[PDB]
Design a protein around this ligand. Structure first.
Ligand SMILES: [Zn+2]
Ligand SMILES: [Zn+2]
Lengths: 330, 330
């Protein structure tokens, strides 16, 4: 009996969010997709025949990577009042990956609901349409909802990578910088690295086609499939190990004599002319970022969407929410 | 300067093996693909316009999963003398994954070369066409070419899984058995589990379509997309953790009240009504299996195809080969 979970349903509507892996959801009048990560689009394919509401970047990926039929894809602009089945909704930048959004639902009866999808809370969100009215219910990405989860800011990670890469290529003009990636994400990191080095980013034709879906301005002048004309390469995450990088260095035919690689997980692992830096890159809120966003939003009700498998996890999170509400006075 | 490595070239011919990620390989007259693993087919797509020689199962996957054009796919039968560009070749079962083959090349000048692709050496190979003549050069999958690498036989792993599953469902008829999988592989494990339980294997429509490509006899009577009509489910490897399995148990709506899961890596990790067994499943030769195969084949020359990134690794392997040759007297 495949059952869609509670945290994927929008109360007072027939709306679901990221609920494509349960077959036909009874009484669902509109299916939203917050972003193009396989955990969330799972189940979508060329055989799907209900309307999918999503951002334009997400729509491009649905069309070109999953071959969802164009007639069922309903892309919506960001930061704009839109209507779906008589209900007003706004898509907000989730600061997660390209095309990723939070969804703000304005119920005709006056209730206002935010579904964050996956997000990394940011002070800029306090400047968004969220500011213009009271938000009653919050469906919250609680991936790192525990005080242990501390990591640097996105800008700190990018600054570290820029500095490390610039210095390494300064000391050795024959060095190659490698960034590991999945299908999307990390664009701001590897584009900044290539920028400081005055280089395009080299990659496979498949990764190149993927980046064409992302509406990045002037993208063709930033990326190339001609690998050996660049100083920065993208490789699959699973190749970022000494064996995989030695192999890539051999594959480049002597054009480079050293690789410096970054991967998400600071002192590098070094074996000869290969070095690997694990960087604390994250597409989700830290505990403190999350706490700040929630104390600013002051929702009446919070529904966690992640780590809700046991009672202990759910109740520990409810405890933090009560403490937050007490300290901020709502 | 993208360069195809030496271990992917067949000497005395214009043949390459699993060399699709280097653009046009200069002077390559025929491209072989040993099996459908992304490390090996990497680079293949609908835009490829040279002939690809492979098994029929691999050909099905190329056509239906990668949309390689049918006119460039050249499937060949197993255990059968075939001709490619005037050269006689045989495809042999590699005992690796469905459709995976080793390739035996019969050069017009009398030289005989075996490329194992990925393989798990088996005594049955000693009964193959390999027996009928002397093999001069061996391009060897050396994934676990180190004495530390010991693990049970495939039959021992399958027997353990059958027994554990049968006993768990005997003690609790409401339990669910889960097997984690990538795109292909492990069929003999999860089909045997379902067999002993008198059940079909439930799975997503995507995994169902994949298994239809594998020429498994009577397959439609062994698998289903109607999950809750079965006792054995397949999930993505990355979902095989307590959070992912708790979530799946919720998704099944109370049909089951317990999950017992197997994954490749014996005492289970248990948290309440979820248990996870790491099983030492392998699609590659153990050190001892490899040693036995090579001492039986007695090749004049061995060329390792894996772990050849450093001199230390290459020379350590050459040392084992010399010791093997000395002990067996060739
Ligand atoms: Zn995500
Ligand atoms: Zn393989």
């Amino acid at each position: 009996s495949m059952t869609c979970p509670f945290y994927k349903k929008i109360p007072g509507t027939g709306f679901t969010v990221d609920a494509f892996q349960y077959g036909v959801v009874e009484g669902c009048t509109a299916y939203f997709l917050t972003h193009f990560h396989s955990d969330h689009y799972a189940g979508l394919s060329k055989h799907f025949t209900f309307p999918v509401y999503c951002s334009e970047i997400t729509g491009n990926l649905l069309k070109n990577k999953l071959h969802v039929q164009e007639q069922y894809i309903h892309p919506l602009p960001l930061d704009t009042e839109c209507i779906v089945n008589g209900v007003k909704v706004v898509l907000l930048d989730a600061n997660h990956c390209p095309g990723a959004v939070m969804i703000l639902f304005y119920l005709p009866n006056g209730t206002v609901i935010l579904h964050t999808g996956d997000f990394r809370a940011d002070p800029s969100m306090e400047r968004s349409l969220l500011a213009d009215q009271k938000v009653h219910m919050l469906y919250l990405d609680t991936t790192y909802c525990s005080p242990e989860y501390t990591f640097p800011s996105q800008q700190e990670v990018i600054r570290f990578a820029i500095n490390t890469a610039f210095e390494a290529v300064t000391l050795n003009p024959h060095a190659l910088v490698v960034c590991g990636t999945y299908s999307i994400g990390k664009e701001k990191v590897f584009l900044a690295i290539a920028d400081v080095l005055g280089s395009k980013v080299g990659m496979s034709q498949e990764k190149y086609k993927t980046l064409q879906c992302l509406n990045i301005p002037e993208i063709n002048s930033l990326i190339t499939t001609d690998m050996c004309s660049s100083l920065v390469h993208l490789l699959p995450m699973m190749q970022i190990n000494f064996k995989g990088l030695q192999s890539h260095l051999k594959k480049c035919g002597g054009k480079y004599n050293q690789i410096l690689a970054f991967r998400p997980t600071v002192i590098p692992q070094t074996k000869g002319n290969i070095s690997i830096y694990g960087i604390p890159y994250s597409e989700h809120s830290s505990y403190l970022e999350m706490k700040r966003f929630v104390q600013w939003l002051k929702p009446q009700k919070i529904i966690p969407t992640v780590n809700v498998g046991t009672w202990k996890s759910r109740s520990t999170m409810e405890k933090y929410f009560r403490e937050w509400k007490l300290e901020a006075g709502y």
